[PDB]
Design a protein around this ligand. Structure first.
Ligand SMILES: [Mn+2]
Ligand SMILES: [Mn+2]
Lengths: 437, 437
RNA sequence: AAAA
C-alpha cells in the first residue's frame, strides 16, 4: 500500500495543472484528474481533451484516474459523482490542487476530500498555483514553493496541451532567407543591424514607404512579370516631380545604398547607384530571380530576423534551448481548423511570451496586430501568457496602444507590452528586461 | 437586530457580483465586499476600484463593509486578514457568493465563515452564478434560480463597473449622417436597403473596392486638398482604358447610380453619368463639403446604419430600450486612456453582445477585426460577453474565421459569431436568433 | 491559474 494520490481539477487552462503535476509527479503514486462532461442543456462543455493531454504529456499512464463530473456548478451532482467515482483504495496522503475548475468544483471537492481522507487521519493537503508570483502554496503545511525557474515547458508541449498540432518553427540555422540569399545573408543582416543600431530605423522605414514600396509594390506578381513592372516603372516616370524613381536614384541615403549593395549582385535592386530597370531582354523568370526575394526581405522580414538575432544573445547565456523555448516563424493549427503564425515565440519557464513584429507607424494597423498577439498567446499559452508588440510607432503612440488594449487580470505586471521604433536598437535588451523581470 | 449579511468576493470580472447583488439586495441589510490590496512585489493589483463601483451602483452606502485581503494567493494570510478584519457583529444569516475571486479565496473564506458562524443562531448559505446556464445555484440546496431574464443592466452601468467613462452613443434619432445628408438620408438609406435586400451586397462591395476606393481613397488626405485629387484623377487617367475613372463612368451598375444620385445635389460624387472631376478654382474646403462626408458614409458607414435599422425593429418588439440596452457608435475611455469604438452594442439581460461591422471580403482584415471585437467586449462587458463580426466574406470564410479565433471558455454556446455576406439581407432575424437563443 |  502506502499509495499517495494527487487530485487535479482540470479546467479550460491546462498549463497550471501541467506545472504542478511536473513538480509533484515523483512524490505521488496515483493521479485523479477531475474533468467535466458535455451537456448542451446546461451549456457546459467538457474539459476531457485537456485531461487526456495532461495524462499524455505528464506521462501518468495507467497510474492516472479520470473522474468525470456531470454538472460543474451543481453542488449535489458534484459530490454525488465524487463519492461514486473517487477511488475506493486506501491512501496515506491525499493531495488536492484546486487551482483549476469552477469555484463550485473547487469548494465541493476540497471539503469532500477533507471529510473523506482527512476524516481518516490520512495526510491531506491543498495547493494553488499563484499566476502572479509563480508559487505553489500549501494550505496546511504553509509552504510556498516557487516553480518559476524549476518547471520548464517547450513549444510543442505547450501547444499540444492547448489542443494545437502540427507545430512548425525555424531556427538560427534554418531561416528561410538564409537560403534565398545564400552566401550573402550574413552580410545583408550585418549591414542592416548596423543601421538599426545607429538609430536609423525611422529613416529606413520612411525610405521603405517611398520609394521602395512605391516602385516594388503594386499589382500582384508585379515583380514576377516584367510587363507589369515595365508599365509600372514608366507610369512612375510620368509623375515627373513626384516620381519615386527620381528619389530612389538621387535622394536615397547612403546607409540604404550600403544595405542594397550588400545583397548579391544577382539579387540587387540597384544598378550601381540607380534603379535597375529591366530591358525587353529580361524575362519574367529573370525578374523574380533578382527582385522578388530581395523585395520580400526588405518589406518587413528583416525586422523579424533582427529582433530574433538581437535576443538570441541573452537567451543562450540564460541556457534556454532553441526550438524548445525560443524560435521564429511559429505555425500550428487546431484539428480541421485554420493555421496561425507568430513571428517570435519565447518561453520563460512556463510563461509564453509571444512577440508580433511590424515596421508600421500606423495606429490602426498596429492596434489590430496587438489585438491579434493577445488572442493567440491566450489560445496558445493560456490566460496568463504575455504578448509584446514591437512597432515602428513613436513612444507616445506605443504607450497609448498599451493603455488602450490593457485588460485587468489581477497582476501588476503588464502582459501587453508595445515597443516603439526607438526601442529597435536595444530591443534585445528591452525584451530581456521585460521578459525576465 | 437580525442582521443578515451577504459576502461578495470581488475579482477582476465585476459583472457577476452586480448581478447577484441586484437580486439579493432586498433580503439582506449588510454587505461585505472582500477586495484585494495592491502589492507590486507579489505582482498583485487591487480590485478595490471594482468593489467601489459595485457599492455605488448597488447603492449600499453604509450597509457596505470593505475587507482588504493583503495576499489573494496565500491561504494563511487570507484567513489571518479575515479574522482580523471580518465584521464581528451579530448576524443571523451569512450568505456568501463565491462566484468571484481567486480559488484560494473562494475556499478559505468559505470555510472561515462556515466555522465562525457554525452556531445555529447563525444560518450559513452559499451561492454561485453559473455563467453557462445563467442561474444562481445554492450550495446544498437543489434550488435553481435563473437570473438570465430577471436581472437587466444598462450600457452606462456595465461600462462603469468595468472602469470606463465618457460613455457616448448615437441612437436612431441622432445619427450623425442623418444630420449631414439633410433631406436625403432616408432616400440614401432606402436605396441601400432596397439593393441589399436584392442580393446586391457583393455587387456594391466590389464596386466599393474598384473603382470607388481607387478614386476617392487613394491618398491620406486627397479629399481635403483639391490638388492631390486632380493629381490622383490624372494619375489614374494615365492608364486610359482600364483606369478606375473609366469603370466609374461606364461599367457602373444602375443601383449604384440610384444611390449616388440619392445624395444631396451639392454632395454627390458624380456629375451626371460621369465622375465630377474637380476643376481649378475649387477650394479645398468646397471639395471637402462635397466628397468628404459622402465618401465616408459610402465606404461602409452605410452598413452600420443598415444593420442598426434591421435590428432596431426586432428589439423594440422585445423590451430592449434604445440607448439603455442597444445602440450604434459607442465610444468610451478609461481615465487617461484612449477611447474605443464599437460599431453596434446590445445587452440581452446582463450579457453584452458587441457587433463589429465590416464590408470586406478579405480574410486578413476581417480576422483582425475579430480580435478587436473579442478584446473590446471583454474589457467593456466582462469575460462572458459575446462578440459578433458581420463580414462580407462567404460562408466558407466565415466558418473558417469562426474556428480560427474561437477560444475555449467552457460553454457549448459560441461567443464569437461571424456572419457573412449572404446573411446581410436577413441580418435582422439572424441577429435576433443568435442573441436571444 | 481573480463568473472553469
Ligand atoms: Mn508580423
Ligand atoms: Mn467597422
Amino acid at each position: 500500500m502506502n499509495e499517495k494520490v494527487l487530485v487535479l481539477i482540470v479546467g479550460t487552462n491546462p498549463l497550471p495543472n501541467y506545472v504542478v503535476g511536473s513538480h509533484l509527479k515523483e512524490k505521488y503514486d496515483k493521479f485523479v484528474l477531475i474533468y467535466s462532461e458535455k451537456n448542451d442543456k446546461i451549456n457546459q462543455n467538457s474539459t476531457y481533451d485537456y485531461a487526456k493531454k495532461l495524462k499524455e504529456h505528464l506521462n501518468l499512464n495507467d497510474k492516472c484516474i479520470f473522474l468525470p463530473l456531470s454538472d460543474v456548478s451543481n453542488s449535489e451532482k458534484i459530490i454525488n459523482d465524487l463519492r461514486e467515482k473517487f477511488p475506493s483504495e486506501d491512501f496515506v496522503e491525499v493531495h488536492l490542487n484546486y487551482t483549476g475548475g469552477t469555484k463550485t468544483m473547487v469548494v465541493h471537492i476540497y471539503n469532500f476530500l477533507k471529510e473523506k481522507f482527512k476524516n481518516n487521519k490520512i495526510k491531506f493537503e491543498g495547493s494553488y498555483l499563484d499566476a502572479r508570483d509563480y508559487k505553489l502554496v500549501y494550505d496546511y503545511s504553509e509552504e510556498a514553493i516557487s516553480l518559476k525557474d524549476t518547471i520548464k515547458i517547450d513549444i510543442n508541449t505547450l501547444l499540444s496541451i492547448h489542443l494545437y498540432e502540427d507545430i512548425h518553427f525555424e531556427f538560427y540555422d534554418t531561416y528561410s532567407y538564409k537560403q534565398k540569399f545564400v552566401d550573402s545573408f550574413d552580410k545583408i543582416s550585418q549591414e542592416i543591424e548596423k543601421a538599426i543600431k545607429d538609430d536609423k530605423g525611422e529613416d529606413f522605414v520612411k525610405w521603405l514607404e517611398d520609394p521602395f514600396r512605391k516602385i516594388f509594390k503594386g499589382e500582384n506578381k508585379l515583380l514576377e512579370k516584367t510587363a507589369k513592372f515595365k508599365k509600372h516603372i514608366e507610369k512612375l516616370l510620368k509623375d515627373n516631380d513626384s516620381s519615386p524613381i527620381v528619389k530612389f536614384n538621387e535622394k536615397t541615403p547612403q546607409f540604404i545604398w550600403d544595405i542594397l549593395n550588400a545583397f548579391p549582385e544577382g539579387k540587387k535592386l540597384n544598378d550601381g547607384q540607380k534603379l535597375w530597370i529591366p530591358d525587353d531582354k529580361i524575362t519574367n523568370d529573370n525578374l523574380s530571380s533578382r527582385v522578388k526575394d530581395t523585395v520580400e526581405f526588405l518589406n518587413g522580414k528583416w525586422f523579424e530576423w533582427y529582433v530574433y538575432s538581437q535576443i538570441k544573445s541573452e537567451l543562450l547565456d540564460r541556457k534556454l534551448k532553441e526550438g524548445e523555448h525560443f524560435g521564429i516563424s511559429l505555425k500550428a493549427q487546431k484539428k480541421d481548423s485554420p493555421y496561425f503564425e507568430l513571428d517570435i515565440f519565447l518561453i520563460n519557464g512556463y510563461q509564453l511570451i509571444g512577440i508580433s513584429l511590424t515596421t508600421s507607424s500606423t495606429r490602426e494597423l498596429c492596434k489590430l496586430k496587438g489585438f491579434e498577439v493577445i488572442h493567440r498567446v491566450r489560445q496558445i499559452g493560456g490566460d496568463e501568457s504575455k504578448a509584446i508588440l514591437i512597432t515602428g510607432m513613436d513612444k507616445s503612440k506605443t504607450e497609448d496602444l498599451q493603455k488602450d488594449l490593457a485588460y485587468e487580470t489581477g497582476s501588476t505586471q503588464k502582459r501587453f507590452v508595445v515597443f516603439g521604433i526607438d526601442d529597435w536598437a536595444d530591443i534585445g535588451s528591452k525584451i530581456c528586461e521585460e521578459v525576465f523581470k
